[PDB]
């Protein structure tokens, strides 16, 4: 786990702790996508919704995938590629999510989906580069994708965040594998 993979896991844990201590809504109020016009210029918020988790399962599953795919992308393609994947997926997923359902949402899984789509498609279209999605983990990803679409979990799923996430990672692996 390089510096990006790491600061991210850290920031997510630090934020999850604040949500336990201060409560979910308090932290949302500070970190959610702008939910009032008076907040539109608070720029951290287009990204910081990625940092908030609402259950132990949410955090744990997201950081497992982040650690593994995030970490792969970091070590083999560099810190910079992971930064850009993250900023773009966070911002785009946040955008589509809020459009469909309003600003009240959170989670790294828009980003994790971009890493899934990215690492898979780059492995298919580009063997040499050194990044692949192992067949077993394609299955575990597909099931993970499927669960959200049909809502087979306690709390409701950000479905725009997911389709938007994956689309970004596919677009970027496409553009990258092209060379």
């Amino acid at each position: 786990a390089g510096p990006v993979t790491w600061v991210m896991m850290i920031a997510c844990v630090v934020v999850f702790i604040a949500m336990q201590i201060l409560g979910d809504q308090e932290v949302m109020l500070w970190l959610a996508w702008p939910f009032d016009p008076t907040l539109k210029f608070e720029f951290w918020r287009y990204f910081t919704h990625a940092l908030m988790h609402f259950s132990l399962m949410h955090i744990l599953f997201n950081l497992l995938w982040w650690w593994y795919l995030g970490g792969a992308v970091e070590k083999r393609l560099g810190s910079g590629k992971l930064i850009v994947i993250t900023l773009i997926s966070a911002l785009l997923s946040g955008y589509v999510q809020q459009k469909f359902s309003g600003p009240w949402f959170g989670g790294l899984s828009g980003v994790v989906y971009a890493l899934m789509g990215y690492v898979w498609l780059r492995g298919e279209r580009d063997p040499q580069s050194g990044i692949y999605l192992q067949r077993g983990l394609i299955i575990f990803a597909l099931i993970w994708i499927v669960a959200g679409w049909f809502d087979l979990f306690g709390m409701s799923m950000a479905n725009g965040a997911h389709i938007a996430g994956l689309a970004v990672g596919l677009a970027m692996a496409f553009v990258d594998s092209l060379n």
Binding site: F54, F105, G107
Partner: peptide, 4 residues
């Protein structure tokens, strides 16, 4: 509150 939707998770992701």
């Amino acid at each position: 509150v939707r998770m992701x």
